[PDB]
Design a protein around this ligand. Structure first.
Ligand code: 4H1
Ligand code: 4H1
Lengths: 242, 242
């Protein structure tokens, strides 16, 4: 290919439903990243590692209780095959609600890895000793439970892929407006039609500060605001208080 | 169908990439919920609402700056068509990093709705006046940015679908173990082979409390622990301190 590839990422995926990953590899910005060789996603399915007639991928938990776990042998063999394909330096990630909570800073840390292997749990998850022996890091995409680790893995791939050069402040987005000039009686703020680029930049920043303060004030606590940001935030708070 | 349907959910989706949703509708537990008529996902693509030769779905932002926005007319017409199909009572949700942060409690609130319409933003998102006029609630799946609202929408569908009867404490999961009895020298905790159901329940609960304290102690602050939980947590903390 001709598209500059230097920072490309390889992501191995272990999943019982590899076809789910077409949602990222066949469409959109991520699909383009795959076609241009900026991103490669390679999947291994534990089902292909079973030897019994029925291709059994689940197993009963010690101690009983409801639920099944992923069967150790097919999952372990799939992980080992993915690790051999990756060569040296691949970090193996398991997605689960018990993992470190993902945020944009963590996305940018993960995007530093040229190789990742993402293990997608189903059922009640994977045997704890496999976490100990095969998993480098455990991450959660949020505090909620899904039917498998595939959507979390897809979410992580998409988030990290945005930080790969060529694929494409700590505050919420400012409001954005497009045509038409009047929509259900609502008008575009005149500043955005002014052509004054500095006034527009400051208005957008002030709106982002105001929205972050009103919706997610804890996000402001994590920032050391610039002098300009402190002033625009004070102005917004004064206006909000009238 | 014969599968009991009483609590079924209908989810309309507005997306430029409706085929991404096959990942949920064709596979796994969610795929089964669709086949059994517990969950219906119906998609409308703004591209089908364009009238120009090139089927234009993006538009330039007022005030310039980088990025495009979703074009208002095709998106608005798609939303209106979805609302007409839904009939009365559909809550219209826009997924974005500026929305209320999703957690399991919020999932269970959302699962009370028999009808949802999920609007998937691409580019720099949707015109603010469309949020004002067409959107009931804005939600985020986590503090990170993706290339579109499709994966967030899929994540929300899967999370809510688990609370639909028939599809399938505030603490992290306890460790789980399956065969074999010894794995890379690591043994299953003897209690889980004891056959003593009460001792197993208490061990699992104590482990969940210990893991939550060590990994996500802020989660314990949100709970009013039961008497039994307070005792097992104190025991775990004492053991951790030796
Ligand atoms: N006890 C349920 C749990 C057992 C272990 C496997 C998971 C798979 N599903 C997931 C995975 C990850 C996330 C997340 N928040 O990152 C949510 N859901 C389900
Ligand atoms: N400025 C970027 C932003 C513009 C507006 C549309 C979104 C689409 N992508 C999303 C959507 C939702 C989430 C989430 N955390 O729920 C993340 N990513 C992108």
């Amino acid at each position: 290919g001709l598209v500059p590839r230097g920072s490309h990422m390889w992501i191995g995926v272990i999943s019982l439903f590899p076809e789910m990953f077409k949602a990222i590899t066949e469409f959109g910005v991520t699909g383009r990243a795959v076609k241009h060789n900026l991103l490669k996603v390679e999947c291994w399915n534990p089902r292909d590692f079973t030897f019994d007639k029925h291709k059994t991928v689940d197993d009963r938990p010690y101690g009983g209780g409801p639920g099944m776990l992923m069967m150790v042998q097919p999952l372990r063999d799939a992980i080992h095959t993915a690790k051999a394909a990756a060569g040296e330096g691949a970090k193996v990630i398991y997605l689960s609600p018990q993992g470190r909570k993902l945020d944009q800073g963590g996305v940018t840390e993960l995007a530093q890895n040229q190789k990742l292997i993402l293990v997608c749990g189903r059922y009640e998850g994977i045997d704890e000793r496999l976490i100990q022996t095969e998993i480098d890091e455990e991450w959660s995409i949020g505090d909620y439970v899904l039917t498998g680790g595939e959507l979390p893995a897809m979410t992580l791939i998409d988030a990290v892929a945005r930080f790969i050069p060529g694929v494409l402040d700590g505050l919420l987005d400012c409001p954005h407006y497009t045509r038409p000039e009047v929509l259900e009686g609502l008008t575009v703020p005149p500043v955005l039609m002014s052509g004054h680029h500095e006034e527009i930049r400051k208005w957008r920043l002030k709106q982002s500060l105001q929205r972050t303060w009103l919706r997610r004030p804890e996000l402001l606590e994590g920032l050391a605001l610039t002098d300009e940001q402190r002033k625009l935030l004070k102005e917004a708070q004064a206006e909000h208080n009238s």
